[PDB]
Amino acid sequence: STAELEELLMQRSLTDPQLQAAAAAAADFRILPDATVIKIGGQSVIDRGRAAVYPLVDEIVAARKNHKLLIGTGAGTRARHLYSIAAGLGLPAGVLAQLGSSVADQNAAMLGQLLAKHGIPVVGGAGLSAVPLSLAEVNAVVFSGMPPYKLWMRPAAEGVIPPYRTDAGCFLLAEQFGCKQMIFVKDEDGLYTANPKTSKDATFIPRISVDEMKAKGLHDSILEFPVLDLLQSAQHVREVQVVNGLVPGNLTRALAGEHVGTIITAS
């Protein structure tokens, strides 16, 4: 049925629904199905320094012996400073994105300097960095997290804060390369009903779907909400897990598929 697809592609517009339906009926190809993507928070982890980073480095050099790892970095509070400045100036979301990309790259550089002795490099070209992943003595890479939408970012309905930040970068990199597992390493056991750092009555949530997550009408979340709309629309990766990287072992247990933190499912 590819002839109809081809003649439509050549004739109709890509907005033609007959065409979209033909395309959805096409094949699926996972590029790194054996790979696992994790996101190291900047404000939650790296900005804590030694105590939170050295243990994770250990966990990573340990885990790479059994899993392929794509370690994306987050930006942190330097990015929030930059966003404050640039918003005070009235500059748009694209600029702010250009700025945060850099913070994520700094954090990646630091992490890579920590991991180089273990054979784990920093790569711009993360997805097709094929070699380090084909090897068992490397089996991992650090790809700073912020996406490339630098000045073309989709602005939010209200404000200049870029909505598609590091979380989205890592998740989309996973969904594209058909990875098997997507993990978010942060400073909390998982998702609660409210920011526990501000509200100590907040209740833990071990598992939930996107629809339920929206129905709860959360004012603040541990993830960027747009990531939810993306997850509801993905095809390869249909769930993500959030864990605490300050707790030792949690990351290793998660890589093994264990449920230690919070699990968010599209459906």
């Binding site: 030694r50 404050s84 500059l91 790259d105």
Partner: protein
Amino acid sequence: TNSIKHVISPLARQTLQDRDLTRPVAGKRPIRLLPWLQVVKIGGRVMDRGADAILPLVEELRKLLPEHRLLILTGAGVRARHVFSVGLDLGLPVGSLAPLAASEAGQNGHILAAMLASEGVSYVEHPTVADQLAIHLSATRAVVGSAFPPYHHHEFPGSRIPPHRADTGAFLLADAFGAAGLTIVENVDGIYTADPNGPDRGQARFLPETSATDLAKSEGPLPVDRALLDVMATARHIERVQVVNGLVPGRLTAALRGEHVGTLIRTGVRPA
């Protein structure tokens, strides 16, 4: 048999370490490439204040473009202090921190250029400054850049803090290009005997003028690097550098015209 294949030249068969052999060739004073250039180093402590300090500065610059050909180099500020705190908690060496701060400088520059784009201003990255500066300035009037020099993993040791920061890079550029003047913009009227934001605030005396030597021999903090004072001694073209407060309108404009509105630092250069 295995003898060296030499290219005939005055410096052939030399190590370039014996000055008595290089002086006949390289011992003369160089030239100015962009003698018509004015360099302005904005400090990061300024940009960190945000609109309150940038918008007035931006208007001043907007009014300066038709008067000068400007290279506006930005500094890092406090984000660099944060990345230092982290990298030191991790035990990273100075050569690993240098680029991490250069980046904050570059981001401040991107901000400023965004605010000035309506006037034809843009950010260059540093390869372009080194090579394609004259043309980027024949097109427009001002360009923005980063002041931290690219000594990123080749930073000098001795200190856990990259000694070659924005001030130093700005001066090195200006003295290489043989620029007309270098002007530094800080959050204070100029240089004092002590930090007027610190505990010795009361004993701080403003220094309207001084030399690089009087400071380098001194001890204590400064709004400028000490490596700057070291390179000043080896300067070739720049004779004086003015430090001025950019929070105060009109002082930058005046300094570009040679007025004494802040602190004057004389280098080791001897005039004609």
